[PDB]
Design a binder for these strands. Sequence first.
RNA 1: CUCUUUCUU
Length: 962
Amino acid sequence: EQRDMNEAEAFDVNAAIHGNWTIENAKERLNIYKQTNNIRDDYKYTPVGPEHARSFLAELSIYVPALNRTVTARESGSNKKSASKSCALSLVRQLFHLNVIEPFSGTLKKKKDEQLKPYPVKLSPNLINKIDEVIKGLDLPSSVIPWAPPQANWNTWHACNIDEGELATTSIDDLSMDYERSLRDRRQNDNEYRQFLEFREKLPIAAMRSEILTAINDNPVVIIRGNTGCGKTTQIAQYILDDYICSGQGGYANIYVTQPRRISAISVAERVARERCEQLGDTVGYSVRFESVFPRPYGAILFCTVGVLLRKLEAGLRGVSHIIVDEIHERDVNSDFLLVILRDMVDTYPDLHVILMSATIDTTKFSKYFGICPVLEVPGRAFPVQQFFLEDIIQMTDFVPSAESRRKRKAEINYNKVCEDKYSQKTRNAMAMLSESDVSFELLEALLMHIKSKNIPGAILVFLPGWNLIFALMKFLQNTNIFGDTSQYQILPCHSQIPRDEQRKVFEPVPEGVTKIILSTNIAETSITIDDIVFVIDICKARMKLFTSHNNLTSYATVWASKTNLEQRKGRAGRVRPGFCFTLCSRARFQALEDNLTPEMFRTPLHEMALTIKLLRLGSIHHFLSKALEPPPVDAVIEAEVLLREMRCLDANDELTPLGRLLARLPIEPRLGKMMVLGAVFGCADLMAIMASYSSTFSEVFSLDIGQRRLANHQKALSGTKCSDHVAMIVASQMWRREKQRGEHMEARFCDWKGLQMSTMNVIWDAKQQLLDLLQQAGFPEECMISHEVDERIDGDDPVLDVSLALLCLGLYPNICVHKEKRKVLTTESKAALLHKTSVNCSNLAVTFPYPFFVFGEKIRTRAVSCKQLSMVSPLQVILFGSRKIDLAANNIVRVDNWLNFDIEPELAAKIGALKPALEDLITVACDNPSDILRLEEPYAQLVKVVKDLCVKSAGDFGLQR
RNA sequence: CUCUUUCUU
Ligand SMILES: Nc1ncnc2c1ncn2[C@@H]1O[C@H](COP(=O)(O)OP(=O)(O)O)[C@@H](O)[C@H]1O
Ligand SMILES: [Mg+2]
């Protein structure tokens, strides 16, 4: 079977920009190039995707001697074959971009067939003549980011004049003297602070302390490398601040600190606040999304995630004295972005000091990055830890694989059967029987039971790939007789999309006689510290998001963690007392793990980050990314540039239009930002914002019970006769708002009854409120964002909701599909796909829907391309908002996006299609004058009126029985 | 058949 998967994966969307290079000729061209340049390199099919979903992966690595670069690729696949095709296409496109191969120009082929039957659409005479009048009316057919030392009457964090309080005649010198006197008095009198310094002097970092300061005082860029638990993050900023205060210059110090994760930043800020024996928000503050406590403008340490600093960079960095980047080894997009921006900072302004601190980096690489900068190694760690591997526990608890899986069970190197002959025979058989991709719950239960038998107090930490395995393990352990006793063991998950209360529950102490088992993803990997952690159990798997750009496919892959991730998870233990680190993989597998995971820049879209580049005015995108540490593939850069230019956020000169600036200021996908602005023009910004926020969450609203492959009848009614996920999400959020407003326990019981997710609703509402606030900041009047109650039970027409569903087509372009029966739909160019089990439109019967056109939010690959966040849309909405060009096919059939066929009058088709440039002009004029969107010239008011009349559900149901 | 790595004043 599964020819449909090959047909769907061969699909291409952006072959036009890359010189007509597609899958069908990419492998041939790559083979020809390799033969010509006598390159003997070959694919590295890296099997992944566990075993119930044996996907694969692939990665060539051709080397271009002439230019001296090394053009490389990394792609996903559902069977070696397809991946290799995608990798070859990426490599060929990249090699084309630096002009080493001529653009393709000959011929491909056409199989089409299966052409879909036309869908008749008719419009009422009043609608047509209104469109005619509307058409007649609308006459239709670089600089340097600045820096400055701290100044009087200026706030560093807010970058605004104070003009308030009694801090007007207070100079910097007087403030520094007051700070020095206060610090001396605190040191002399308070005994808790003195005890804290007595503890701090015992840390290894103290032995290096003095010389570290010298480096900071002699070189703008300093790299610090040391073992985990040696006290870098909570000590370096304090050392700098205390030196500045004691040296009579306490008012001239401002030390930013950047943490890779929210919980890490919060925990480190709290620990710094406790170490100075002071309340939060006075000297040390933190600023993460949806939670910010700010310290005094002078002599303060601010902990913020990298994205927060990137958003702060728009206002400039006037008044900062030091910037610290922790966990630089993360290699993600924001870290490298901040690295380039900080290099520019140091080069332009030598007074600013930048300190890079981490535990496991290539010191030579980052030193040569900054044009040779000092690197200081901190020797020694806090306490030693004992490390074990899978075969060690197998010998060390006499575990035997269950007969259960022994038969339930029923050339890639399987390291689980390779081990030293020092160990016993039965241990070797037990190690060999276990598979690699899957995990064993019997193994974990036996290991935890033996740890209990060890009678060593302390928390247990289990690192897991994702939510599914975490909650499956929670359910499995809860059913056990021993671990089900809440008085003996307490199990806490640690996930970013879990409620914030549960995230903070991982730091609070537990009562006597109970052991805390924390099941975490890689959120608990870096820089956090829990006092009672003694045991770290590493499953050695990490999940990443693979994005195939040529077919616009997304997937989640559970791949083996690198050695750096394992070393950091090991370092999470043994910070206050010696412990154990049980790592679950063979010693051969441990030796076979990659050094570091691939950086995010090589496997992520760059449209948002290129837009941010243009916002802060660093210059051309291509040159800026050529200045980056690890240059992203040129094809991704050109795809981002074309995506922004085509959507009109950049003019012909690659400059920033006001729409581009406004979309840059929003924390949303640029397409979602344009869609939100259009929703604001039509006076439906509340629903528009909440719906856009649900389309950038990667979380689920409805929680199908473990296994059930459909929602049910409580949840599948929220959607109501609309048969759309977004209307159901709106109804659920509207009910949940009232339920919370009447009680928090009411919120919990409502979420239990209706089968929702409390954390998903909270994050969606918070993102929607932030979007509304930012839209208000730009000048859009509040009258455009009044909350509109949605009645999903009403069938027929609803202007606001229908125009919202129509604007979805513009916001989720080109994610459109056509349903046939049961769960089978066709995506663009008629590629077969399945409706996901979570979506409310999934059905086991051969039921039919009124309008067979859908727009979905995500296209996830599994063992069958699946779709996510579906919503039904009328043909008129699709024609208006879901295509760029509309043409005329044979026998008078209108063709949309070269794959949709409509039976509609060509004259009226041209009439309706002429409105899209008018809509672009409306967006431009609305973003130009945000305060003047609700009042407009008469032609644009008529345009809005006819668009509202066209976006009705039954606007094209005249004379049709349907 | 596995709905949910991290981040965005
Ligand atoms: N909750 C806590 N209880 C006791 N000690 C702590 C706690 N949090 C942090 N510490 C101590 O503070 C130090 C901070 O180390 P840190 O600089 O975060 O390590 P790294 O340099 O790897 O980030 C650690 O050595 C740890 O012993
Ligand atoms: Mg290394």
